[PDB]
Amino acid sequence: SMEQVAMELRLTELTRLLRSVLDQLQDKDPARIFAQPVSLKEVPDYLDHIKHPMDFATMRKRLEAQGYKNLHEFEEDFDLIIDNCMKYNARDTVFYRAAVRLRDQGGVVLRQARREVDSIG
Numbered sequence: 001s002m003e004q005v006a007m008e009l010r011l012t013e014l015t016r017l018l019r020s021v022l023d024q025l026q027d028k029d030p031a032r033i034f035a036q037p038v039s040l041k042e043v044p045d046y047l048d049h050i051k052h053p054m055d056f057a058t059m060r061k062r063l064e065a066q067g068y069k070n071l072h073e074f075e076e077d078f079d080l081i082i083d084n085c086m087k088y089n090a091r092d093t094v095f096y097r098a099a100v101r102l103r104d105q106g107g108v109v110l111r112q113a114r115r116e117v118d119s120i121g
Contacts, residue, residue, distance in 0.1 A: 054080035
């Protein structure tokens, strides 16, 4: 149906906007602390602590499969990256501090992305 095509074109355009949001958020992590999944070989207890691990590579695979239907879903995953790190790691650590900085800087980007998603539809 033509309705299904138009919906898919909207999904595709959301995916475009989310890819750019993702690039801007990742630029706020120059250290690359959040680039890849936590290794269970190197942190064998990780899953006892963290129930839903997340990282920018895993967000990027979901994105390229057009797997985010709305900004809310994308934000949920971004928040997991931050929130997981701030639980596993103590306040005095480079990891925790990096998550705080990513959150604060990411907020700016996400605030305007929400306006763009509403504005364009």
